[PDB]
Design a protein around this ligand. Structure first.
Ligand SMILES: *C(=O)CCCCCCCCCCCCC
Lengths: 128, 122, 177, 155, 65, 87, 99, 79, 459
């Protein structure tokens, strides 16, 4: 019949085709009620300190500061050197360096060999 | 465009390729064949600054057309006779080229016929 | 599943949203109006055939099968109104929507060109700062403990006062400034 | 801002997980941190990994352009999943179908162009003939050296 | 004056725009007909195409063997 | 381009497109006529009415506001709010 | 079910406040209070003066330096006359006419 | 500032293809309740529209007449 | 060179005896006078350099750096007078004295003909910079940034002192002209290998090189605005100048000994550029852009061709100007919104149009738009590296994408889109900030008209 749609990393499943949307259990209702309560609390705080006529400045957001501190200043204390991190660091740190060193060394060795034997065309080459 | 199908779907022993031509001497089958003669000397056609592609065997009407185009300014639409002469001469040269192609094709056909006749006879 | 008024979407709401998007996509596939009318009446009949269904699990199964039908039968590029999201001129004029507090930073030389407008602005700011404490004191005494359970806001209860948190929804910029 | 609001180490005991979920303004059963593989993520939550185009375009957000709310725990790659950048929104047809169709079309066109290059199309004419030894002097040939005289005969 | 916006009916048209539109369409068709009458060769062909099958073997210099 | 709108104009527009409905008697409805209460309509008919509103005024009403407009005056108020009429 | 009456009251109050604000957005006739403050000269200032200036520049500062302005030499045909020395170029060979 | 609308009773679906589709729906046991809404589309100046061939040869008559007088003038002025 | 050192050292009585309200006016006026005086160093000859005495000289490489330094000091004085407006008077005078001492040390570092004098003041430039960073920096991490910067520099540069004393004991002199006429080739040995490493690693750290650049995204962020100007516009170029001076003596070992380091930049300027695509911080974005540009300078110096040298000179001057302007714009945004994160303040073209124009022009000069001298330097380095090897053009071309891919990105999220609703303290642009932007930018566009004065000593 119809081809079933499967999710991907760059193409998620649609909301309407998700079975978990149609689950009408009371635990899901409690979860959505708690989520709505949290959202209403945060929205009420934001628009209480946002509609203030006295305030002039920036309504600072703890989530933004939390995100910046996690992205920049919290990476090192939560790092432990194991096999995965060491293999990823060695694979992506000194891999391309060795690869490009070998490529450029090979090309320049071939070019110098051709130049010193009078084979490469260097007729009008006077700007280097 | 049947020659392409003849060479590609049939056999290429008879159909002449356009890469190198001719594969035969011009004195073969043509007693006293005379060569094409230019009307334009190389000096006057050099001073006319013709394109090297346009420096072909029929540059005389090209020079006449360019002189008409230079002399009839700004009346830019009344040099049709000279360009008609020029592309008529180019049409005649194209006719000569396809005649040479047909001559090469018929000579290759004769080669195939002669070689099969000599293979069957002996 | 993400609404400011309700925590969730009921079955009837899902069916109505499906009918809306299916009719819009059918209008996209059926550009000529009479053909669209034929197939829109056909879709209305198909939706009315299973209207009086009392078994909830059968209605849910029909809803899921209709969702699969719709997803198989989408237009790859449906018609979007120019100002709706995804449209050709959606959020086009948002560069022109200057907030009104920039008028507080105007020089007195250019403030002298509009005397009556700035007098009205001053009286509006006076009204806002007169009603703000009444609005917040209404907000504390209306909502139950533990924070509000819904994002909905109360109106102006008493007389002579304004609804709470009204300034940024009244003084919002126009669509085409 | 106070020191207990910043992210900390990876939570293991359930009470630290509860305090972390309280810190990030989310339910305790909805808070799933990144796996403890020592990549520096810490206790930051693992969000459902969806772009900002997937959010509701009609619900009024605190940041209407970003489609985001004040105080919401934002994604670890929010700077990656903004509406100006890579989108994860569902497609009318499948991802593998798109990849297979595009790769097949490109491969078929490349193979057919190779076939056409191997088998060209021409006209049944002889080669173009130029006078004066194929324009030997006009082609940059030196006048001091005498070339082989070639000539074209009429047909 | 300006053109008032009508509702569910055919809008008001100036005589100038329809006159100019008909004039330019007639000019295009006159140009096409005039250029096909005079040139008549850039569409149909310029010179006859001699098919190679009617050329004799004497003018091609084919030796009989 | 873009002639200005007015409240009585948009009210005339919504009423004018409302009397062209074969499920509605034009001699009964008013500007406070409920659909499933005073006119005996259906929810799907309300959806069709809202789509007619969108196709009439050229802008799409969102669903979460389409499920709330129940009288012609409510549609007038919503269009007035969305288009910033009577400046 | 549409609005609650509570929401209807809120929407009505916000709508009348918004209409008052939009009415206040209008302009009085005195606003803005602005303070108090040759037929074809475009063909003179924008055309002729640049022609004068850069003709002076080209004639007395560019062409005085070598190889600044190099022009392709004029085309030479069989049958015309040269101004610089006066030779008549000889005419071309007789055409073996095709027509 | 002031806008005036035509009569709402003047839109009828008779003669238009909306009548045809309403009759087809009746033959299938259905009805179209929105035909009068777009009965204006097929009635008035928006009815009797040209086809592709009619739109391609727009102004062909005057152009052919101009070609005729032009070729006659070019015939006479040569001799 | 005494005509510039003495007024610079007399600027300290000028700033220490002035009134409490006219220190900025007097200091800016007299530093602008010194910047005007600086133009007398353009007396350059096609064969010989300009030699003043036994102690000081200035060829065509040091001259643009000197003019840039003495032009840059008034710009720092105008920039750093808003976050120090509430400061105590004595600390204000101490800050101005630190800036004056830093300029004096720099302009006599660029002119020392003898190498150990160059080293002495090249390290005397550490103290005022570090004092400024660790004193007038804002947040907690200024102390760690200062420690990282100081220790990277000194731990890289003590073997440079050892090698220079070895050169003085071996060759017999450290004068640059004598060394120009007494230079001997360096043969192949391990001693010469570590000689090359000791001579190069100090400038490798101060360039910075990729893998030794970890002190840049701290010291460029925690420092104040004037500290950011000197950190991005002189000191990196000071390391480049020292590299150009000291690569004379290290031939022909360099022809293979530069083989790893080039790769460490050729890949490095990719990776750091990619970091600018995923940076949540504006100042860090500018710092990593500086890392990428200076890595390109490193490659140009290491391949040692004439075209690469002129490209390196033009690139150093243009990058100093552009990085200083970008730091000024970021500091203005930080002053207005009181946070450094890039995503907080959006849509500022609707509120600040002329500063948006300055942002657009600075971003255009950042991504090497022709005919600016940024493009001239980048182009010349590209020609020289293509002469060095072919596949290098790939490592150039991809960079030519990614640079724009962050620059316009930096243009969008700070200036385009819908503005942040709750931020309502966006004051209109002052005349001081606009004057600072114009004084940063107009010399660059004017240098695009006559670039031959910044194309190095072998132009
Ligand atoms: C053989 O047919 C020689 C002509 C060149 C190859 C075939 C080209 C076919 C397509 C062009 C002609 C189309 C006629 C409707």
């Amino acid at each position: 019949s119809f081809p079933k749609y499967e999710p991907s990393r760059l193409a998620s499943l649609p909301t309407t085709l998700d079975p978990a949307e149609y689950d009408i259990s009371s635990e899901t209702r409690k979860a959505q009620a708690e989520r709505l309560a949290i959202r209403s609390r945060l929205k009420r705080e934001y628009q209480l300190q946002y509609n203030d006529p006295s305030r002039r400045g920036v309504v600072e957001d703890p989530a933004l500061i939390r995100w910046t501190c996690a992205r920049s200043a919290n990476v090192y204390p939560n790092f432990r050197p194991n096999t995965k991190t060491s293999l990823l660091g060695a694979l992506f740190g000194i891999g391309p360096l060795i690869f490009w060193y070998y490529v450029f060394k090979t090309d320049r060795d071939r070019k110098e060999k051709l130049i010193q034997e009078g084979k490469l065309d260097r007729t009008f080459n006077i700007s280097y | 465009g049947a020659h392409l199908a003849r060479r590609y779907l049939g056999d290429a022993s008879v159909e002449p390729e356009p890469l190198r031509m001719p594969t035969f001497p011009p004195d073969y089958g043509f007693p006293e064949r005379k060569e094409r003669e230019m009307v334009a000397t190389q000096q006057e056609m050099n001073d006319a600054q013709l394109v090297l592609q346009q420096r072909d065997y029929c540059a005389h009407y090209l020079i006449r057309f360019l002189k008409c185009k230079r002399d009839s300014f700004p009346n830019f639409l009344a040099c049709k006779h000279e360009q008609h002469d020029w592309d008529y001469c180019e049409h005649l040269d194209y006719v000569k080229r396809m005649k040479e192609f047909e001559r090469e094709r018929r000579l290759l056909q004769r080669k195939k016929r002669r070689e099969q006749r000599e293979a069957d006879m002996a | 599943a993400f609404l400011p008024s309700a925590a969730y979407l009921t079955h009837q709401q899902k069916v109505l949203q499906l009918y809306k998007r299916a009719l819009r996509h059918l209008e996209s596939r059926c550009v000529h109006r009479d053909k669209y009318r034929y197939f829109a009446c056909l879709l209305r009949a198909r939706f009315d055939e299973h209207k009086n269904e009392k078994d909830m699990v059968k209605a849910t199964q029909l809803l899921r099968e209709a969702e699969k039908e719709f997803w198989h039968g989408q237009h790859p590029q449906p018609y979007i109104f120019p100002e709706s999201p995804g449209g050709t001129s959606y959020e086009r004029y948002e560069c022109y929507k200057v907030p009104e507090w920039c008028l507080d930073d105007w020089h007195p030389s250019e403030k002298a060109m509009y005397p009556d407008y700035f007098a009205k602005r001053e009286q509006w700011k006076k009204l806002r700062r007169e009603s703000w404490e009444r609005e917040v004191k209404q907000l504390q005494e209306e909502t139950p403990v533990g924070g509000p359970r819904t994002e909905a806001l109360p109106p102006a209860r008493k007389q002579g006062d304004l609804p709470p948190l009204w300034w940024h929804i009244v003084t919002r910029p126009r669509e085409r400034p | 801002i106070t020191k207990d609001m910043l992210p900390g180490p990876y939570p293991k005991t359930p009470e630290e997980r509860a305090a972390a979920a309280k810190k990030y303004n989310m339910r305790v059963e909805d808070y799933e941190p990144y796996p403890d593989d020592g990549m520096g993520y810490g206790d930051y939550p693992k969000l459902p990994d969806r772009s900002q185009q997937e959010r509701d375009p009609w619900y009024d957000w605190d940041h209407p352009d970003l489609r985001l709310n004040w105080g919401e725990p934002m994604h670890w790659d929010l700077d990656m999943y903004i509406r100006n950048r890579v989108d994860t929104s569902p497609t009318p047809v499948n991802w593998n179908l798109m990849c297979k169709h595009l790769f097949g079309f490109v491969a078929f066109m490349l193979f057919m162009f190779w076939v056409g290059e191997t088998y060209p199309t021409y006209q049944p004419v002889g080669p173009k003939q130029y006078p004066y030894n194929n324009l030997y002097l006009e082609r940059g040939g030196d006048p001091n050296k005498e070339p082989e005289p070639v000539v074209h005969y009429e047909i | 004056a300006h053109i008032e916006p009508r509702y569910r009916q055919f809008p008001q048209l100036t005589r100038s725009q329809v006159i100019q539109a008909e004039f330019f369409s007639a000019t295009m068709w006159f140009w096409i007909l005039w250029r096909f009458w005079h040139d008549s060769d850039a569409v149909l062909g310029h010179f006859p195409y001699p098919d190679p099958s009617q050329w004799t073997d004497e003018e091609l210099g084919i030796p009989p063997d | 381009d873009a002639p200005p709108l007015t409240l009585e104009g948009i009210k005339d527009r919504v009423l004018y497109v409302l009397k062209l409905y074969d499920k509605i008697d034009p001699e009964k409805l008013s500007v406070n006529s409920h659909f499933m209460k005073d006119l005996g309509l259906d929810s799907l008919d309300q959806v069709e009415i809202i789509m007619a509103m969108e196709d009439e005024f050229g802008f799409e009403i969102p669903d979460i506001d389409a499920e709330k407009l129940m009288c012609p005056q409510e549609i007038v108020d919503y269009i007035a709010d969305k288009k910033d009429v009577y400046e | 079910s549409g609005y609650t009456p509570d929401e209807k009251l809120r929407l009505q109050q916000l709508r009348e406040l918004r209409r008052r604000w939009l009415k206040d957005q209008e302009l009085s006739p005195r606003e803005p209070v602005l303070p108090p403050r040759r037929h074809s000269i475009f063909a003179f200032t924008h055309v002729l003066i640049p022609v004068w200036i850069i003709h002076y520049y080209l004639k007395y500062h560019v062409t005085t330096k070598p190889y600044t302005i190099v022009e392709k030499k004029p085309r030479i045909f069989p049958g015309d006359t040269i101004l610089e020395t006066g030779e008549v170029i000889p005419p071309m060979k007789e055409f073996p006419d095709q027509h | 500032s002031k806008m005036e609308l035509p009569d709402y009773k003047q839109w009828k679906i008779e003669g238009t293809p909306l009548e045809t589709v309403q009759e087809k729906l009746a033959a299938r046991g259905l009805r179209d309740p929105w035909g009068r809404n777009e009965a204006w589309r097929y009635m008035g100046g928006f009815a009797n529209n040209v086809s592709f061939v009619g739109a391609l040869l727009k102004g062909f008559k005057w152009g052919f007449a101009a070609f005729v007088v032009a070729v006659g003038a070019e015939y006479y002025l040569e001799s | 060179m005494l005509k510039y050192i003495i007024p610079t050292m007399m600027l300290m009585p000028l700033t220490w005896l002035s009134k409490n309200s006219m220190i900025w006016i007097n200091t800016t006026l007299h530093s602008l006078l010194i910047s005007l005086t600086s133009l007398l160093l353009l007396n350059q000859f096609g064969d010989n350099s300009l030699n003043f005495s036994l102690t000081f000289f200035s060829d065509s490489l040091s001259t643009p750096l000197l003019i840039l330094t003495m032009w840059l000091l008034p710009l720092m004085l105008m920039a750093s007078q808003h976050h120090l407006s509430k400061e105590n008077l004595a600390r204000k005078k101490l800050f101005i004295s630190m800036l004056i001492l830093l300029q004096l040390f720099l302009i006599m570092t660029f002119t020392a003909t003898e190498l150990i004098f160059f080293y002495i003041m090249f390290e005397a430039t550490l103290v005022p910079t570090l004092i400024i960073i660790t004193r007038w920096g804002n947040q907690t991490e200024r102390l760690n940034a200062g420690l990282y910067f100081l220790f990277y520099t000194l731990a890289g540069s003590l073997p440079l002192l050892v090698a220079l004393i070895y050169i003085q004991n071996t060759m017999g002199s450290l004068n640059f002209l004598i060394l120009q006429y007494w230079v001997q080739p360096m043969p192949n040995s391990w001693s010469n290998t570590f000689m090359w490493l000791a001579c190069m690693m100090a400038f490798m750290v101060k360039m910075p090189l990729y893998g030794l650049h970890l002190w840049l995204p701290k010291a460029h962020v925690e420092a104040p605005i004037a500290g950011s100007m000197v950190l991005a516009a002189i000191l990196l170029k000071l390391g480049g100048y020292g590299m150009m001076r000291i690569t004379l003596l290290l031939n022909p070992i360099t022809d293979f000994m530069a083989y790893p380091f080039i790769m460490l930049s050729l890949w490095g300027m990719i990776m750091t550029s990619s970091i600018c695509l995923r940076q949540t911080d504006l100042k860090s974005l500018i710092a990593y852009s500086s890392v990428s540009h200076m890595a390109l300078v490193i490659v140009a110096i290491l391949i040692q061709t004439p075209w690469s040298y002129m490209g390196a000179t033009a690139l150093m001057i243009a990058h100093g100007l552009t990085s200083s302007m970008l730091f000024c714009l970021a500091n203005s945004n930080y002053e207005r919104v009181h946070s450094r994160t890039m995503i907080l303040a959006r849509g500022l073209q609707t509120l600040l149009p002329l500063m948006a124009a300055w942002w657009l022009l600075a971003s255009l000069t950042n991504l090497a738009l022709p005919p600016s001298i940024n493009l001239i330097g980048e182009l010349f380095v590209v020609m020289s590296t293509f002469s060095w090897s072919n596949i290098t053009i790939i490592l150039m071309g991809l960079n030519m994408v990614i640079t724009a891919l962050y620059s316009l990105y930096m243009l969008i999220t700070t200036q385009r889109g819908k503005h942040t609703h709750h931020i309502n303290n966006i004051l209109p642009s002052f005349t001081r900030e606009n004057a600072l932007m114009s004084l940063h930018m107009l010399p660059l566009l004017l240098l695009s008209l006559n670039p031959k004065i910044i194309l190095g000593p072998l132009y």
